[PDB]
């Protein structure tokens, strides 16, 4: 019910249980685009290095979802404990 995360910029922070990964990111001053803040437009797509993922979007193909290389932070989350985004 809590997750940390890292970057290629080294920054690291925590998603309190009431937040979207996206809101966590913005709260910590990560520039990350958004529009359909439900999982469809796809502009918030961001890339993943590590971590185990749950998708709730309707943008990523089943194969894209099964590759841990992408995530839509507006609606998706991490069930692992850490997740590293390549940003």
């Amino acid at each position: 019910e809590y997750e940390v995360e890292l970057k290629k910029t080294g920054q690291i922070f925590t998603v309190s249980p009431g937040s979207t990964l996206l809101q966590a990111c913005l709260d910590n001053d990560v520039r990350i685009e958004a529009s359909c803040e439900q999982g469809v437009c796809g502009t918030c797509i961001t890339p993943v290095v590590s971590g185990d993922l749950e998708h709730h979007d309707t943008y990523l193909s089943k194969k894209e979802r099964e590759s841990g290389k992408w995530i839509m932070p507006c609606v998706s989350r991490c069930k692992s404990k850490k997740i590293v985004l390549d940003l």
Partner: protein, 330 residues
């Protein structure tokens, strides 16, 4: 201008067969046409529908003001004749001199199907086919080919309107809006064999990418089925020549009962879709969950764009690799 270069690998419809036969009293053409800003001429040379650049290699006159002579297109100015490969075979002023090797105009893949004439400007990836029309061959079905209709909108925007669900209540209240089934669903979409496929409840789409839609409406199979086939010719950056062919089982009624109805719903869309600016969809449009089809459509066109830059094999994969989202089996 080369954001639209990938479009040259696809087959595009440029005219109806009856437009070519009407064009010139000979019934062989020539007919001038414009596709992705290219100026082309179409003509029947022998048993072939031939498509060349509408510009003669000699003094740059338009072959579309010429005439078909036997199996050749004859320029109207000094009478040069061009064969089905765009090579000059007769220079009337020096019939005994050699024909310069450059005496040649570009030729393009030109094939008829479904009653329309399709042109493929760039065949070098050898991996695109003419869009799919479900109702051809099926002999239970009467097939009508409406006159082409022209919109001041792009093939992408016209495409998206034809596959749109959210807009019935507002543009087509009198003609298409079903007030009990008022709100649109989200449906799984498959990529298969270069086509998008998705269904409703029953409407079944088979959208051969980029610009063709094949819509099979059945009345829960009880009554009888109706097929709409709509394809957009990207004439230039702002314009579409749009083709609608429709087939129906129930052939006992008047063709002009349907032609008027189609005509009506198109007249309802045209002024809205033409109003959209900028004409090409910029990156600041805000979507919501009902827009799944439009987003998925744009996702794939971008991939086809990038795949094209990478080259032939990349493009073949992008277009033909299956991407199944539903339970239907292939």
């Amino acid at each position: 201008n080369d954001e639209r270069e990938y479009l040259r690998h696809f087959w595009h419809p440029v005219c109806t067969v009856t437009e070519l036969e009407k064009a010139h009293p000979s019934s062989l053409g020539p007919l001038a046409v414009k596709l992705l800003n290219e100026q082309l001429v179409v003509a029947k040379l022998g048993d072939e529908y031939v498509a060349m650049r509408d510009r003669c290699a000699h003094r740059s006159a338009k072959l579309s003001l010429g005439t078909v002579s036997g199996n050749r297109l004859q320029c109207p100015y000094h009478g040069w004749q061009y064969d089905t490969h765009g090579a000059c075979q007769l220079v009337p002023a020096c019939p005994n001199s050699p024909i310069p090797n450059k005496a040649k105009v570009d030729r393009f893949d030109c094939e008829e199907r479904y009653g329309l004439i399709w042109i493929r400007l760039d065949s070098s990836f050898d991996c695109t086919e003419i869009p799919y029309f479900s109702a051809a061959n099926d002999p239970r079905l009467r097939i009508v080919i409406q006159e082409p209709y022209w919109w001041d909108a792009t093939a992408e925007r016209r495409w998206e309107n034809f596959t749109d669900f959210s807009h019935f209540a507002f543009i087509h209240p009198g003609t298409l809006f079903d007030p009990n089934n008022a709100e649109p669903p989200i449906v799984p979409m498959d990529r298969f064999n270069g086509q998008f496929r998705f269904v409703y409840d029953s409407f079944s789409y088979t959208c051969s990418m980029p610009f063709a839609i094949n819509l099979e409406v059945s009345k829960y199979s009880s009554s009888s089925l109706h097929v709409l086939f709509n394809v957009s010719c990207p004439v230039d950056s702002h314009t579409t020549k749009n083709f609608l062919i429709f087939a129906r089982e129930q052939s006992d009624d008047s063709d002009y009962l349907h032609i008027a109805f189609n005509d009506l719903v198109f007249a309802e869309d045209k002024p809205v879709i033409e109003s959209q600016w900028p004409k090409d969809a910029p990156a600041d449009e805000v979507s919501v969950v009902a827009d799944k089809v439009s987003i998925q459509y744009r996702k794939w066109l971008r991939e086809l764009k990038e795949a094209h830059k990478e080259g032939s094999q990349a493009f073949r994969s992008a277009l033909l690799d299956p991407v199944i989202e539903s339970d239907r089996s292939y």
